[PDB]
Homo-oligomer: A and B are copies of this chain.
Amino acid sequence: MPNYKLTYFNMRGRAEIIRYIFAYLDIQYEDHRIEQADWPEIKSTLPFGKIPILEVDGLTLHQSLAIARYLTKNTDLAGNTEMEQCHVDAIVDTLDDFMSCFPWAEKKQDVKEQMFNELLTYNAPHLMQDLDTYLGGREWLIGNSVTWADFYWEICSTTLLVFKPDLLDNHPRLVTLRKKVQAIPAVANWIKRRPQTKL
């Protein structure tokens, strides 16, 4: 049985998808959260110098979504058919591409607010509208059961709602989908028990 150690900041951020997957599959792991001060010494040891990382039986994996896909392989979270797995991958990359546009590391707090604002004002509504149309009246984003794409939607939309509360005022179906993710017992339990962080 694999020993798992997840390393990231004390933050939902890019690690959260992995956290939801372990919760859902009832897989025990070490949720190793590092204070900023412990980062330079860890970073120096990593091939690509980024987190999150996941150690599996003492072997290091990197890239949040690569890890997420590895953990869901051969499970019901992956997608039920090969083409469905493709749609799961595609939705995840669409969300990630958008989340990746935000200047998270930008030090000038004034340059940062100008950019976050432009993305949320002009770009975000187009995405939400595309996601809404894409979902239509279906139960989940892909197929007839929950996938890690639904989890990723709930996670990304939570972050976006921190900056733009009215993001989904015109998309009750997308709100419902968040609530469906949030009501899954293993996910709800995680949401109840996790550390409260802005991001």
Shortest distance from the beta carbon of A8 to any chain B beta carbon, whole Å:
15
Residue of B nearest to A130 (CB): B48
Contact across chains for A61 and B83 when beta carbons are under 8 A apart:
yes
Within 8 A of B (CB), among A136-151: none
A183 contacts B by Cβ under 8 Å: no
Contact across chains for B65 and A130 when beta carbons are under 8 A apart:
no
In the assembled complex, the Cα of A89 lies from the Cα of B66 at a distance in Å of: 5
Tally of this chain's copies = 2
Within 8 A of B (CB), among A87-127: 87, 89-90, 92-94, 97, 100, 126
Within 8 A of B (CB), among A60-87: 61-63, 65-67, 69-70, 73, 82-83, 85-87
In the assembled complex, the Cα of A134 lies from the Cα of B93 at a distance in Å of: 25
Shortest distance from the beta carbon of A69 to any chain B beta carbon, whole Å:
6
